[PDB]
From a paper:
Prior to this phosphorylation step, ribose-5-phosphate (R5P) carbonyl group is transferred from carbon 1 to carbon 2. This reaction is catalyzed by the metabolic enzyme ribose-5-phosphate isomerase (RPI). Beside its critical role in the CBC, RPIA is implicated in the non-oxidative branch of the pentose phosphate pathway (PPP).
We solved the crystal structure of CrRPI1 in the P21 space group at 1.40 Å resolution. Each monomer is composed of six alpha helices and twelve beta strands distributed into two domains. The first domain contains the catalytic pocket, while the second was proposed to play a role in the oligomerization of RPIA. CrRPI1 is a homodimer in solution and in the crystal packing. The homodimeric state is also observed in the crystal asymmetric unit with α helices h4, h5 and h6 and β strands s10 contributing to the interface. CrRPI1 catalytic site is described free from substrate and product, representing the apo state of the enzyme. Six water molecules, a sulfate ion and a sodium ion are however present and therefore allow to predict the coordination and placement of its substrate R5P in this pocket through structural superposition and sequence analysis. The sulfate ion in CrRPI1 hence occupies the location of the phosphate of the ribose-5-phosphate supporting a conserved mode of substrate recognition. This sulfate ion is coordinated by polar contacts with the side chains of S60, T61, and K155 and the main chain amine of T61. In our CrRPI1 crystal structure, C149 and C250 position their sulfur atoms 4.4 Å apart, a distance compatible with the formation of a disulfide bridge.
Residue numbers in the entry:
A (entry chain B): 29 to 266
B (entry chain A): 29 to 264
The structure:
């Protein structure tokens, strides 16, 4: 009630930075919640409370932010194994399966976080969903440019996502393009995806798809900030 | 004996074009074998032997070839259902599972041929293998450019292929770029892949991978030209 969404995001972020220890290679997430964690890491480095940190950014925005804070930076090519990654999420379900990449940086986030021994996800409690898709907001699929209308229709008609709407993401007059020159088809649900693993496999199995925003069996710890306080949720059913 | 590899390829190609009937939407393959079939379709149209054909090219190269022949063209966006697709293969195993993409066009070939009611594969008999990977030549994987060095190492270490060699495909001193602006990592095996379906799943499951050259449960008919003559094998 008194705590704004931004204040909750920052509370979750600071709790997550407690998983960062001196000497670690850290995956630096993207978006407004992650930006609070990047700033906290930068602050702690400046204060000498952390030392010998290398960050791997997941977006141009994060690269620029971390560079401005003086955080040493590397790429996955240079540091292919990360100790901890901290990132936000667009949706979090009761399994700690998440939708990510809605705002961009989908594949980079996925590749960095798959390379991380511990993935700490930070959210305010508005990101909790009954099931993936349940926010009714975009669930992104990265696709090749060739025959993108065909692929969009193919996606919308996959049994595993039956009932969704699908829209090619536009950047004004031109289709939006990812870091890898691919297009995005956003899927929109009115009820959650029933079997997220089956949906992930079916979408990846579609020739023409590069990747998608279902980040399954990846998050190890979710930090959830809400009006009542901050909850640290280890992944259920280990 | 007297027949050269190119002559065998053309024999297979001409036999495959017999599956093309007036009225059809036809997937047009890529590579030297398929090019003979594209040229034959174009000839038959010019001669009036075929009518009402639309072609759907699997590469920029084949688009250009069909353009030069006057074959009406479309894409899956306009013709999502094809009647017949004719294409080559790098390896053909006993069940008509194949490896493709040595020419770079695996992705669009896969999309086009997956949309085709009948996929006719044309080869000379040097392409037949007992098991996929068994040619000891490239099993291609199309990957995104971002951190491709990283992706190549992850690819090489997947349980399903671990043991192979993995090489970023080069065009001289620069990496090869596909029609989709991606790179290719070619995997090289000394013995056939243990489980091609499992290898397909694992490779597709690797974030950074676009698609790969294992074309499983796709070919319906394989036309094989060898010194003895032309053989027609339907899917077991
Ligand atoms: Na017609
Ligand atoms: Na090819």
């Amino acid at each position: 009630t008194q705590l704004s969404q931004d204040e909750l995001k920052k509370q979750a972020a600071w709790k997550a930075v407690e998983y960062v220890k001196s000497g670690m290679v850290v995956g630096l997430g993207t978006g407004s919640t992650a930006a609070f964690a990047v700033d906290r890491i930068g602050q702690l480095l400046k204060e000498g409370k952390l030392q010998n940190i290398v960050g791997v950014p997941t977006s141009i925005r994060t690269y620029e932010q971390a560079l401005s804070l003086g955080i040493p930076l590397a790429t996955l090519d240079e540091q292919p194994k990360l100790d901890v990654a901290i990132d936000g999420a667009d949706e979090v379900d009761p399994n700690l399966d998440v939708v990510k990449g809605r705002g961009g940086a989908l594949l980079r986030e996925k590749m960095v976080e798959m390379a991380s021994a511990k993935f700490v996800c930070i959210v305010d409690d508005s990101k909790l969903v009954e099931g993936l898709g349940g926010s009714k907001l975009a669930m992104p699929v990265e696709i090749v440019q060739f025959c993108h209308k065909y692929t969009l229709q193919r996606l919308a008609n996959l049994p595993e996502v039956k009932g969704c709407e699908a829209k090619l993401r536009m950047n004004g007059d031109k289709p939006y393009v990812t870091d890898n020159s691919n297009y995005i088809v956003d899927l929109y649900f009115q009820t959650p995806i029933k079997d997220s693993q089956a949906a992930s496999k079916a979408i990846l199995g579609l020739d023409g798809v590069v990747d998608h925003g279902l980040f399954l069996d990846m998050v190890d710890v979710c930090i959830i900030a809400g009006a009542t306080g901050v909850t640290v949720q280890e992944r259920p059913n280990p």
